[PDB]
Amino acid sequence: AHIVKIYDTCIGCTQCVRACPLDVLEMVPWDGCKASQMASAPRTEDCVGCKRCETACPTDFLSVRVYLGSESTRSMGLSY
Amino acid sequence: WTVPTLNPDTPSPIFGGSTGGLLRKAQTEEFYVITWEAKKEQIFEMPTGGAAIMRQGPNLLKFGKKEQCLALTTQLRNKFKLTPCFYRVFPDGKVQYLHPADGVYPEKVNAGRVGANQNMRRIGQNVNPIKVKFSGRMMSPAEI
Amino acid sequence: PFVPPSWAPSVFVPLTGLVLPAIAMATLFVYIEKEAP
Amino acid sequence: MKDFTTYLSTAPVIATIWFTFTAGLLIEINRYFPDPLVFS
Amino acid sequence: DIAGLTPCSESKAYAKLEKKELKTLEKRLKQYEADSAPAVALKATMERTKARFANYAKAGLLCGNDGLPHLIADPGLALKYGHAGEVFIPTFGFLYVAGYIGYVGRQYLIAVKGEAKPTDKEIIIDVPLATKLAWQGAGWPLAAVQELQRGTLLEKEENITVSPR
Amino acid sequence: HFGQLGIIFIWLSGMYFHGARFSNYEAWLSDPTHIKPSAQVVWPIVGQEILNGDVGGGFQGIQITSGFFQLWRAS
Amino acid sequence: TKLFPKFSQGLAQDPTTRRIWYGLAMAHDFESHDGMTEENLYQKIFASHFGQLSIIFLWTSGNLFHVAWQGNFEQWVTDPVHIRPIAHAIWDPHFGQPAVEAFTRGGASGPVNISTSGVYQWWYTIGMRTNQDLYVGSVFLALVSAIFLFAGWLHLQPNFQPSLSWFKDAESRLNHHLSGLFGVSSLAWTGHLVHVAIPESRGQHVGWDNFLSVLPHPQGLTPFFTGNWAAYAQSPDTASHVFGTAQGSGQAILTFLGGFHPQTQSLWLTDMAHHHLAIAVIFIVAGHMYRTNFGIGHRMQAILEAHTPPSGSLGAGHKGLFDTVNNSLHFQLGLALASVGTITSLVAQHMYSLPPYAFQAIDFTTQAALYTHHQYIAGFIMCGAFAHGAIFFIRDYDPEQNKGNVLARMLDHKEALISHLSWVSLFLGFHTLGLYVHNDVMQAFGTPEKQILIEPVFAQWIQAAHGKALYGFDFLLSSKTSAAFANGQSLWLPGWLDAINNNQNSLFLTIGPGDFLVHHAIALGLHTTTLILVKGALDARGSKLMPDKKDFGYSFPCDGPGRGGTCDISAYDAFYLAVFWMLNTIGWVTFYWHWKHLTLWQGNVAQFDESSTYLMGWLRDYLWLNSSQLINGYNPFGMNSLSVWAWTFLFGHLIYATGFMFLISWRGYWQELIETLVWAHEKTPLANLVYWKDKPVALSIVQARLVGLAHFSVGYIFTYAAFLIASTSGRFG
Amino acid sequence: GMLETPVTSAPIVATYLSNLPAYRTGVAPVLRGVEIGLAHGFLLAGPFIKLGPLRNVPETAEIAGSLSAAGLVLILALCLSIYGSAQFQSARDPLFSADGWSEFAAGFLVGGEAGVAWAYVCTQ
């Protein structure tokens, strides 16, 4: 499975969650940012590694990072 | 809110079929089922190609991978204002409800969710690869 | 005594070009598809 | 007229004029001083 | 002579090359009438060819065994034996013009960075400003040295972005 | 589309003009087999006039292969 | 889950055809294996090195065996000038009768291949004379191969596994390798030359059966122990000596003649014996420098800590670099590859110009093949050196432990280094290409006198300094009144000056404007290749585009379409790009070497001197003109012995072009295509009864780059090899 | 869900496929291989005989062509053997099992070689 990490520079804009085509990410309560919410990656067994989440992140440098890992049927995106 | 239970008897949208659907993986490994309630008969686009008509009321479709179910979910939500959900169905009959995980779609912050894979530092504060060398496998400094 | 027999190429060339590769491919194929306990 | 002279100041038009002028100068020098290989 | 070369004015191959080039034109000139336009064009080419071989020999170029002029690039040899006009003098001709272009462009870039929208002055040229800078670029070698001596040519390291190391 | 047609008419006009002013078409009409069609003439500069070849008909220029001479004779 | 690969559990659980590909690709990257420890890593490398050694000696055994069994070495030594060496016999049931006849050559009974490797000249020069000599050497090297293979097994056993500290004893290993592996080996080779090779070149047989009763010199070791070492330089072989016979032979065993043997046109055997004797002494002494268990010598760490310029111009200097180098296998391998890579090029440059082997110079095909062979190997080795330098920076470099030293300061001005390499490459490219194009236009318009021909006076000046009197500079060895000319006039200058002023050999060939242009093309290639490799290494850890690149490793596909798009951003991809430029550069180098020797060998250097100043000359007179015999190896009217090279020539073009498929078309296209094939197979009766165990997938992004480069590189090499051999041997065979 | 066509779902097509030995369940796997082996072994001799390197030799052509076809049958039998070893390591039809496939492969070799021999007899 790929490795997805959220870093404390997140502003809780939710754009990574909206952009994920696999429903890997979600928003959870937080107190470290004005929005009082932080991105979370609870279901990384379904991440395909497309990095649409990274494309959507506004912070500099990124607050959501994907590290490509071992390949399974799910992570490879196979329908067979 | 409580986890819904899949009803296999649900009728499926009117559709003549295609060559883009399920393969042997569904019989042996797993497949996915998406269900939603339609306010009226309407034409939508299948993620596997072609046009289908959703029946008024309950609808049910089966797909070969999770991304296909969520791709149709995005279409139904944004273009028709519906609220679909889908499951993972194993060959032995087990059903695993998937989406939305807690009844609230992930883009909306909900109470009771526990953060996962959250590092309390910036990317620039990761250690050098030399510090995790010979840890038992290949691992990034972001994994610590 | 070091000189091989005049017929050696007729045997060794087919042996290393057809027979041994066939055994090696068959052996390797079964090994790479073998399932661990 | 202000806008038209502004259009003539865009990069492609200036490049066209400047290179037409620069090429003309180099061509005309070789017309009157043919086959120059060294400076005397 | 230098590096075993010989002057083109004294080279048999150099003289033979000119005969061949003129001979090729003469053969073509036979099929045209005296006053016809093709004949006039061919003779004009012949006059230019003869002048070319006359000028290169006069300039004192060295010729190889092939009979072709060879240039001398070492400043010492060029200045000692009167070949400075081949590479050495052309060298400083280029560097003056090249620095002229570079210096004028740099001045324009700095001038427009104080404007409200610097990027608009880079796709729509401020021709009145560009023209003024072009004429003043004739003194770039003096201006450039003064900036180098005043410490204003270069930017300080603390203001230049770099990647992590 | 009118813009495209305008450009094509300029292109066609140029071909006919260069046939009228920079060609050996009249000479070619008399001896079509022994003369090479030519409708481009280069200026003498930096030695490039070698490209004006001896195409026949008391003319020097680049030999064309577009077939305009044969089209013009047919019309 | 699948067993294979055992070293990666992540790969073993991969359910696709990816796993087999990556199982092979990651097999020798020990550091990435599951459960790897530093001590076990070193022990695994040590055993692998024994495996390489046994393979090398078995490869040498095979070459000796086949020449003895199937070659014509005994016939070749009787007339090396007019006989072609035989590599091995052909047994191919696909041949037709005409092919059997065509390849039957060189005096053999059946079809054979002609050797281009030059082993005949090498073995003949060192004293081998009969097939029995070759047979015994073959058996000996097979035994040595087996011993090394056994030693690799032995040192993997519980009581024979060296500890980690043993592998990190730099001082002890350097002492032994300098004095023992370099020095004693060189001293032993001197003994062979004095006892065997030199007597054999004078018509005397010395072998194991009698070498203890034959004096290498009439005065046996008496001059050596009394200091009268000049007794061994007296009575050298005369200028009329016939190699291999006693006619005109001398008695000296250690000389400094310093030229070529007049008959063989190669280096004197007595000069090569004195060379290795002096090298042996130098290396034996050099191996007593570093400290070991005896309380004398240098500690390498102490030397490095001391060399810090007082002004602070190098910062902390070389502080911390002993641990950095000693703890990084990639820093060591990078240094080893860079050193060996440069040495391989030196071998190429010196062997053609100062041929050491008898009758090597006249074997034109062998000369061309050897230079091209070693220059291409050097090119690949240099790319690897920079590759592992970039791997070092990611995996092994520690910024805290290198704070302020020279290595950390290289990263501090990497932008200055890269941007200046960029400027040099741009200048060379613009002006070298510009001058070639200017000369092509002048040639096209029929005015060759208007082209820009810059004499290489700086290089001709160096040639004059070495004694070449053609250019008239007349100083140093070219000036008969100079101290340098006078002082050496009794040792080696007579032989050297005779050789350097003969224009029929390769010793400092005459150069002109054509040589000027191509040398700047080579500089363009070296600088651009270095730019790509250096930029790859210095940006390996991060850039403004990818600040955290070091967290992703040496090789990874990309970072996705975001931030403008990040294709080929990894340091591995920089190496992949650099290989194309290395091939282009070596291609320019070898084209230059080959064409200049083809026209010299044909007695018409003027063709090169006049055609090499413009690029149509290279296309027309080098490639097009010299392809004629090659492409007629077979045709509608028949075939000849060049048909194999004609076939290989097209074989090379085909593989080259197949590589373009992987380089241009990228994965996503193919993955979609394979899915339709997956659907079709499951829906086809009588075929869906069979099924795969690995789910088919398209090759990965990284894998496509490697495979495409492999096809590009293999086709590049084969195409030129066929052209080089066929165009040379066909001309001079 | 799936696209049904006359080619995919027809009565004549379905009946024909069920009659083939591959789809005829209730038959011993060894017998299945022999019937499949005979059919493929017989046809395989054709192209080798008529287009081999010895096609133009008067009598050697038949021997060489059929002898080469026999060699290809042996290679094919080896492919079946290793396929069963890989595919079946850990159900209704005995053919798709470790023991069944091994018997099926053995039958293919005997049937295939016999088919090649029978083809040679027909030629001469």
Ligand code: CLA
């Ligand atoms: C080094 C490897 C190698 C060797 C030794 C051979 C050998 C042969 N090839 Mg080639 N081939 C090879 C690699 C090789 N090939 C590769 C890699 C390819 C793919 C590019 C090809 C593609 C190829 C083709 C397309 C053809 C050949 C053919 C031939 C035959 C040519 C002589 C002839 O006229 O036979 C005539 C045939 C005979 C005299 C029969 C010989 C015996 C047969 C082949 C096997 C008999 C087996 C026996 C019944 C049972 C097992 C016995 C065993 C246990 C002892 C010969 C058997 C020709 C041929 O006839 O193939 C059958 C042919 O058409 N080959």
Ligand code: CLA
């Ligand atoms: C790019 C490098 C380079 C190279 C390889 C050379 C090479 C050479 N130069 Mg040149 N030179 C260069 C750049 C170079 N030069 C530059 C940039 C300049 C301008 C500053 C000069 C200015 C110059 C002069 C004034 C003279 C030479 C001379 C020479 C030749 C003999 C002297 C010598 O040993 O030079 C080797 C070069 C170096 C070690 C580098 C520094 C060279 C300095 C600048 C000149 C040294 C002159 C020397 C003391 C003269 C001795 C007496 C002479 C009669 C031999 C030699 C072929 C001499 C010659 O033969 O003139 C006809 C000479 O008189 N050069």
Ligand code: CLA
């Ligand atoms: C008999 C009437 C007629 C004629 C001759 C044409 C001719 C043409 N039409 Mg068509 N058109 C017509 C009726 C006609 N149209 C009608 C009734 C409609 C509305 C339903 C359209 C709608 C239409 C569209 C939307 C387009 C065309 C386009 C074209 C051009 C296609 C390119 C080509 O073949 O160039 C061959 C060129 C020539 C033979 C040169 C002919 C030039 C002269 C002036 C005649 C042009 C025809 C025009 C109707 C004459 C009267 C115009 C006005 C003064 C009343 C061509 C010039 C395309 C085009 O390029 O438009 C610019 C295009 O996009 N036409």
Ligand code: CLA
């Ligand atoms: C002493 C020499 C040496 C050593 C010990 C190593 C060792 C290593 N290198 Mg290095 N390397 C070297 C030289 C060396 N290298 C050279 C010379 C180059 C430049 C070419 C490189 C370039 C390089 C790169 C770019 C990389 C390494 C990597 C590695 C590591 C893994 C190797 C691996 O798994 O390969 C597995 C090898 C294969 C699967 C086979 C590859 C076959 C190639 C493509 C050629 C195929 C030719 C073809 C079959 C010919 C067919 C001919 C036809 C007619 C039949 C390992 C630590 C990798 C790493 O991750 O390091 C940390 C890595 O990415 N090396």
Ligand code: CLA
């Ligand atoms: C023949 C093919 C070719 C050419 C000409 C180039 C040229 C270049 N490469 Mg590239 N490269 C190639 C193939 C080629 N590459 C291949 C196959 C690969 C493998 C993928 C690479 C990989 C590669 C890398 C990784 C790098 C380069 C770099 C470079 C530059 C080297 C320095 C130089 O020459 O500056 C002088 C420039 C040139 C010679 C380029 C041509 C300039 C022309 C002649 C200008 C003509 C202008 C004229 C007015 C016409 C304009 C017409 C138009 C308006 C219609 C240069 C831009 C390096 C770089 O960027 O260094 C700074 C670099 O890092 N190349």
Ligand SMILES: CC1=C(/C=C/C(C)=C/C=C/C(C)=C/C=C/C=C(C)/C=C/C=C(C)/C=C/C2=C(C)CCCC2(C)C)C(C)(C)CCC1
């Ligand atoms: C990135 C990196 C890396 C890599 C690197 C490389 C790859 C390099 C290379 C380099 C090189 C490749 C170099 C070379 C050099 C050379 C030189 C420096 C030379 C010199 C010479 C001389 C000095 C000579 C002299 C002489 C002469 C000329 C003549 C007479 C004699 C005499 C001897 C005097 C490493 C691993 C470190 C790690 C870190 C990073």
Ligand code: SF4
């Ligand atoms: S890489 Fe793609 S699938 Fe994975 S979390 Fe990011 S957007 Fe979702």
Ligand code: SF4
């Ligand atoms: S897009 Fe970036 S900033 Fe926004 S919620 Fe996701 S990780 Fe946080």
